[PDB]
Amino acid sequence: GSLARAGKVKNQTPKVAKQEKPKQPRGRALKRLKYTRRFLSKTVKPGEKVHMNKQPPGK
Amino acid sequence: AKKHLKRLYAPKDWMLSKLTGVFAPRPRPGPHKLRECLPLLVIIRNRLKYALNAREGEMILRQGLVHVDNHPRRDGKYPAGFMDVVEIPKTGDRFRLMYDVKGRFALVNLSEAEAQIKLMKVVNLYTATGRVPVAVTHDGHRIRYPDPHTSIGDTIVYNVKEKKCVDLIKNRQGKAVIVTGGANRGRIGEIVKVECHPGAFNIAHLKDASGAEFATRAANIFVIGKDLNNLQVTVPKQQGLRMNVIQEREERLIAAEARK
Amino acid sequence: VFQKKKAEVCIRTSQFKVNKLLNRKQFIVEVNHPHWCGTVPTQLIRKKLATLYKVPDASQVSLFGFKTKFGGGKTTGFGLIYDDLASLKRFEPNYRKTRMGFGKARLPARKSVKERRNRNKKLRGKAKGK
Amino acid sequence: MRNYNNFNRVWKAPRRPFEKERLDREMKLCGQYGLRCKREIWRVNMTLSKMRRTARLLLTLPENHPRRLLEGSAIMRRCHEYGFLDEEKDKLDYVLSLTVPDILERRLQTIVFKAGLAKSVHHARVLIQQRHIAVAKQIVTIPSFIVRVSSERHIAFADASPFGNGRTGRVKRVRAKAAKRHA
Amino acid sequence: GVVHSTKMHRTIIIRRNYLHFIKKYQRYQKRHKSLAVHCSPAFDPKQGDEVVIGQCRPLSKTIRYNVLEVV
Amino acid sequence: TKTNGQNAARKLVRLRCRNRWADKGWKRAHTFSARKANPFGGSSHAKGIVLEKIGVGAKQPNSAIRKCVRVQLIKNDKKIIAFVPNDGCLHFIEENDEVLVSGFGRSGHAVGDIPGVRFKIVKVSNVGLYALYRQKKEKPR
RNA sequence: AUUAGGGUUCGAUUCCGGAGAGGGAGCCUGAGAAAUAGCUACCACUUCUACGGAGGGCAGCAGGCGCGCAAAUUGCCCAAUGUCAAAACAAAACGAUGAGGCAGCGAAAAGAAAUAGAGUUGUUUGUCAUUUCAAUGGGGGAUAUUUAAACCCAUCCAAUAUCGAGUAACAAUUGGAGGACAAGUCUGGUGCCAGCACCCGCGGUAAUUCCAGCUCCAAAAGCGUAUAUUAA
Ligand SMILES: [K+]
Ligand SMILES: [K+]
Ligand SMILES: [K+]
Ligand SMILES: [K+]
Ligand SMILES: [Mg+2]
Ligand SMILES: [Mg+2]
Ligand SMILES: [Mg+2]
Ligand SMILES: [Mg+2]
Ligand SMILES: [Mg+2]
Ligand SMILES: [Mg+2]
Ligand SMILES: [Mg+2]
Ligand SMILES: [Mg+2]
Ligand SMILES: [Mg+2]
Ligand SMILES: [Mg+2]
Ligand SMILES: [Mg+2]
Ligand SMILES: [Mg+2]
Ligand SMILES: [Mg+2]
Ligand SMILES: [Mg+2]
Ligand SMILES: [Mg+2]
Ligand SMILES: [Mg+2]
Ligand SMILES: [Mg+2]
Ligand SMILES: [Mg+2]
Ligand SMILES: [Mg+2]
Ligand SMILES: [Mg+2]
Ligand code: NA
Ligand code: NA
Ligand code: NA
C-alpha cells in the first residue's frame, strides 16, 4: 500500500542541464573517427589491455 | 464459360512479360488447341512488331490484312498453330508456324509455291452419311475423300490455295518426323521403332541426324518426310538437332567475344 | 580543360523497320547532346529527324517516350515517320495528336457521363437523352 | 495487389551480437575501406557465403558431371572477370579460399583510391557520390560498384565533372555570380 | 487383387495389399484397399484367389470394375 | 530402445505421436486449455479499462511496493493485474482510464519479484506510457 | 519461413481448383445458372408513404458504423493489359469497363545510399586551437523531359543568355555500460524507499545495476517492446 510515494526519487533528483557540446560526425565520418582513435592514435603495448572508458581514481 | 486468361496462366511460349499486364489474349475455339497455339494478336504485336499495342493490332487484323492458310482472319484471338501458313500480302511476308529445337514457336520464311502447301496429320477417320470416308486432321480440317491408303497418324500434304490433297506420307519406321509435344518438342529425327501398348500410349523411339536417340509418345510425332535427307517442308534454322547445353554456352560466349 | 562551345545535337536511329500496314517507318531514336543544358525539346528532335530523313514536312514525324540516360549527354526515345500528314492524323493516337496540336477536344467528365446514364436507365423513350 | 516484382535480402546479422574479436575485426575493415556501417561488411559476407555454398555443392559431385562442368566454369569465369581470383588460379577449390578483403578490394571506392584519383578511401567515396568518377565514360555514383578487370583501365574523371572536362563547380560559379553582382 | 469375399450375388470384394513409404522414418507400412467388383458367372472364383479386373462404367453405388481373368 | 524393422513405420509413427504429448511446450501449442485460460486470448496486446490502483509487495528477499493497476479487458470482460513500469508512471494513470496492456515477456509466466503478475501497461489514453515518462508527449485532457 | 543433413512450421491472401453472395429453399430464361448489382416465398434485419401501398442485400470500387492489438482516397483514366460487342482507325462521327492501370495514404517487408573532403600554421606522431581551398546534393527553378493528364524519377544551373552549405544550426536516433554481453574502482542524488532486474540479482548511508550529469559501448535511418513461430 501507500501509493503516495510513487516517483519519490525522480522528483527528488536535482535537475542538471545537459551541457551544450559541438555535434559529432554522423555516418562514415564517425566510423573513421572511432577507427583512428582505436587503432591509429596510440600503439597498443604487447600484453596490456585497452581501457575504453578508464575513469579517474575515486572512492 | 471461361472468357479471360491470366497472363501467368498463359503459355510460356507466348513470351509475354509478367509485369506488363494482368491478362493475355484468350484464344477462341478453332483450328488448334488453346495450349498448343499462337494467337494472331501475339503474332502481329509481339513477334512481327508491326503493331505497337493491341489497338494497332486490331487496326491491322480487322482490315483482313493477315491471311492464315490463304484466308483473311480478322480475330486477334484466332488460334494459329503448327504448320499454319501466315501471309501478309501488303508487306510481302510469308512464313510457316513451326517449332524450333527448344520448343518455341518459330516463323520460318516461305517462298511462293511453298506457302501453297501445308502438312496435316490425320487424327481420326470416320464415315459420314452417304458412306463418305472423312479424315480429321490435327488442325481441325475434315477431308471428304482422302486417299484409300490413308491411316490415323499419317500426314497429308495439302494444297491450301486449291483445297485438295496432293500426296500422303505414311507413318512407318524409317520416316522423318518432328516432335510436336513434350520435352522433345521441335526435335527432328527418324522413326527407329514404335512400341505398341494397347489401351495406353504408344511410344515412338527416334534417332536424329547426329545419332542421338530419344523417345516420346506416338501422339507427339509428326511425319514430315520419307527420311531425314528428303523432307517435304522447310524446317527452322537449327534443323531439329538438339545441341549440348555446355557446348552451346561456350559457342555463344566465343561468338559474343568475336563480335566485340 | 573546359571550353565554352555551342551545344549541338546528333540524331541516331536504330532497329529501323518499314511498316507498310500502318504507312509509317518505325525506329528507336537516340540523341547525343554533349553540352546541352537540360533536356532536348522533342520539337527540335522532330526538325532534326525530318531534315535527316528527307521528310518534306516535319509534321509526319511522331516522337514519344524519351528517356534521358543517367549521367547526362544522352536521350533515347521512339520515332515514327509517316508517309503523309493524312496517314498520321488517321492512325496516330489522340493523345499524341494533342501533343502535336492536332488532337480533339477533351470529352466531358466520365463521372457526369456515368451520372447521366444511370438517370436515363429509369426512363422510357423521349425522356432518355431528352 | 497482383504485382509480381521480385525482391530479396542481401545481408544477415551475425549470430552473436557482442564478440570482441569480431567487432574489432569489422571495425578494422570499416576504417581501412571507409565503410558507413556493418551492413556493408555483412553484404559481402552473404555474397561469399553463397559462392562457397555452390562451390561446396559442385565439388561434392564427380568431375565429369555436366552440372559441375557448366556451373564450375561459370563461377570461375565470374571470379576472373570481377577480379576475385587471379587468372592463374583456375581450379574450383580456389573459390572456397575467397576472403572478405578480396571482394572489398574490387569496390569502386577502393579501386579509385588505389588508382590514385583520390587521396584516401573517404575522399574516393565522396568523389564517387558527387558524380566525379566515370567508368568507361559512364558516371557511377555507387561506392559498392564492383569493378571488372576489363573496366579497370577505363576509370577516370567524368567529362561532365569540373575535375574532368566539365564546367566550373559550385564554389567558383557562386563567387563568379557574386563578383558580377557586387561589381 | 486377391478375392476377399464372395457372399454377394455376382459381386465380389477384392483386396489390394501394398506397402506405403514414410519419408521421415525411411520405412514402409502395410496398407490395403478394398474394391467391389462385378464377377461374371463364367469365372467362379474363391476366397484367396487372384483376379485381374478391368475398369468399366459405374454398375452400382460401389462397383467400378469387372473381373476379367481368374488366376 | 526402439524398433528397427524396414516395415515398422506405423509403429514408429504411433510411438512419436503418443510421446509428443509429454512435451509441455508441444501440448500447450496443440491444446485449447491454455488459450481458454489466457486473458488475452492469444493476442499480443489487449485494451482495457483501469479499475483501481493497487500496490503489490515484492517477493522475498526483495522489499518494495510495485505499482500496478487492476484492468478489466474490453474484449472479454476479464480482470487482470498489470505492472506500471518506471518511477512516477502511476501518476500518469487514473481510474476508469483506457490503457493498452502487453505481456511481461515470459509468455504467461510471472516476471521478477512481483508475484502472479504477467502483464504490464504500455499505453494510456492512446498515448505511450514510456513517451509520457520521457516527456516527449503529454497526456490528453 | 527456418536451415549441415534429417526435419519443424506457416499457407485467409495475387496463379490453379472448389464454395458462397444476410440466412434457407425453390425456380424461370438460356448452349451453360439451382444465377442473386435475375425472379418466388419464408425467417432475421431494415427504407419511403398522402396509411391505400411500395421497397432494400457492398464477402465489387471508394467510403461510413461497429468490432478489435490490428489494416489507406467517397481521387484520376480507359493511354497500356484484357473482356463483351452489331464493333479496325479516320471522316458532323471519341462504345462500356472502380476488371485493370495511374497517383494519394503507407518506416509490413526489400534494394541503393547523405549527414562531409583535402590541406596549411602552431599546440615520429596523434589530439587541440587556427587559417585556407575545392566539391556536392537536400532544396529552388526550367528551352524542357516524363505522363492519358499530372506526379515521381532522370537532364541542366547557359547553348549569346540560367539560384543556392560553415556552428555546412541543412544540428541522428534508439537502447545500454556487475555477469551472460560490447562498454566506468567517475561524479552527485536516493537509502530494502523510489525503482531496476527476460535469468543470476541490485537498493537497508561509500549503489560497478535505481534517478541524473559526464564519458563510453552497440546497431544505425533506423532502434526498442509484446505475442506467435524456426534455429538454439
Ligand atoms: K469495400
Ligand atoms: K537503464
Ligand atoms: K554513487
Ligand atoms: K546510469
Ligand atoms: Mg530468486
Ligand atoms: Mg491459401
Ligand atoms: Mg478465418
Ligand atoms: Mg481464386
Ligand atoms: Mg454461385
Ligand atoms: Mg454481410
Ligand atoms: Mg455472378
Ligand atoms: Mg441463389
Ligand atoms: Mg452487390
Ligand atoms: Mg434474398
Ligand atoms: Mg481492384
Ligand atoms: Mg499496420
Ligand atoms: Mg469507330
Ligand atoms: Mg506515398
Ligand atoms: Mg542531418
Ligand atoms: Mg535538386
Ligand atoms: Mg509514375
Ligand atoms: Mg564486458
Ligand atoms: Mg528477452
Ligand atoms: Mg545490466
Ligand atoms: Na482411349
Ligand atoms: Na553535374
Ligand atoms: Na481499355
Q: What string of DSSP letters covers D48-91?
A: HHHHHHHHHHHHHS-TT-HHHHHHHHHHHHHHHHHTSS-SS--S
Distance B27 CA to G202 C1' (A): 77
Per-position b or e across B21-41, b if 16+ CB within 10 A of its CB: eeebbbbeebbbebebbbbbb
Distance B246 CA to ligand 19 centre (A): 53
Distance A39 CA to G124 C1' (A): 16
CA–CA min distance F71, chain A (Å): 17
Cα dihedral angle (B43, B46, B51, B55), rounded to 10 degrees?
Answer: 90
- C-alpha B141/C-alpha F39 separation (Å) is 73
B56 touches chain C (CB under 8 A): yes
**Residues C21/C90, Cβ–Cβ less than 8 Å:** no
Q: Which residues contact C110 (CB under 8 A, 6 or more apart)?
A: none
Can you tell me which residue has the cell 490502483?
Answer: F53
In order of A38, A48, A49, B92, the CA distances from A44 in angstroms are: 9, 7, 8, 83
- C-alpha B187/C-alpha B200 separation (Å) is 23
The CATH architecture to which C2-128 belongs is 2-Layer Sandwich (3.30)
- C-alpha C59/C-alpha D107 separation (Å) is 49
Q: Which residues of chain C approach chain B closer than 8 Å at the C-beta?
A: 17, 19-22, 26, 91, 93
For C99: left if phi > 0, alpha if psi spans -120 to 50, otherwise beta; the answer is alpha
Residue D135 dihedral angles phi and psi, to the nearest 5°? -110, 115
Can you tell me which residue has the cell 496492456?
Answer: F101
Sequence ranges of the domains in chain A:
1-59
- C-alpha D128/C-alpha D157 separation (Å) is 10
A18 touches chain F (CB under 8 A): no
**Ligand with smallest separation from the Cα of D23:** 22
Cβ contact, residue pair A39, D35, below 8 Å: no
* Chain C partners within 8 Å of D158 (Cβ): 71
Cβ contact, residue pair D138, C1, below 8 Å: no
Q: What is the DSSP string of F72-139?
A: EETTT--EEEEE--STTGGGG--TT-EEEEEE-SSTTS--TTSTT--EEEEEETTEEHHHHHTTSS--
Dig out the grid coordinates for D85 from the structure. 581470383
**Residues D95/D76, Cβ–Cβ less than 8 Å:** yes
**Residues A8/A2, Cβ–Cβ less than 8 Å:** no
Helices of type H across chain B: 40-42, 54-62, 245-259
- C-alpha C95/C-alpha C118 separation (Å) is 28
CA–CA min distance D36, chain A (Å): 4
**Residues B224/B178, Cβ–Cβ less than 8 Å:** yes
**Residues F113/F61, Cβ–Cβ less than 8 Å:** no
**Measuring CA to CA, which residue among D162, D137, C93, C130 is closest to residue C78?**
C93
Cβ contact, residue pair B91, C20, below 8 Å: yes
B90 touches chain D (CB under 8 A): no
- Residues of chain D numbered 139-168 and touching chain C (CB < 8 Å): 139, 158-160, 162, 164-168
- C-alpha C11/C-alpha C71 separation (Å) is 19
CA–CA min distance A13, chain D (Å): 33
Dig out the grid coordinates for B239 from the structure. 534443323
With 0-12 / 13-18 / 19 or more C-beta atoms within 10 angstroms meaning exposed / middle / buried, residue E24 is exposed
DSSP D146: B
Helix crossing, D121-129 with A28-35: angle to 10°? 180
Distance F90 CA to ligand 23 centre (A): 24
* Chain A partners within 8 Å of F91 (Cβ): 6-7
Distance D176 CA to G132 C1' (A): 19
How many residues are listed for chain D in this entry? 183
Per-position b or e across D52-87, b if 16+ CB within 10 A of its CB: eeebeebbeeeeeeeebebbbeebbeebbebbbbee
Asked if chain D contacts chain B via 3 or more Cβ pairs within 8 Å, the reply is yes
Residue C76 dihedral angles phi and psi, to the nearest 5°? -125, 130
Cβ contact, residue pair E28, F9, below 8 Å: yes
Asked if chain C contacts chain E via 3 or more Cβ pairs within 8 Å, the reply is no
Asked if chain D contacts chain F via 3 or more Cβ pairs within 8 Å, the reply is no
- Shortest-distance nucleotide from C75 CA to C1': G155
CA–CA min distance F28, chain A (Å): 36
**Measuring CA to CA, which residue among D138, D86, D135, D87 is closest to residue D109?**
D135
Dig out the grid coordinates for D158 from the structure. 567524368
Residue C129 dihedral angles phi and psi, to the nearest 5°? 80, -25
Looking at this protein, which amino acid is placed at residue F15? L
- C-alpha B17/C-alpha B7 separation (Å) is 8
- C-alpha D17/C-alpha B249 separation (Å) is 44
Looking at this protein, which amino acid is placed at residue B156? I
Q: What is the resolution of this structure in A?
A: 2.2
Q: Which of the nucleotides in strand G have any atom less than 7 Å away from a protein CB atom?
A: 6-8, 14-17, 31-32, 67-70, 76-84, 87-91, 94, 96-101, 109-119, 126-127, 133-137, 141-149, 154-165, 167, 169, 171-172, 175, 177, 181-190, 192-199, 201-204, 206-207, 210-221, 225-229
- C-alpha A52/C-alpha B200 separation (Å) is 81
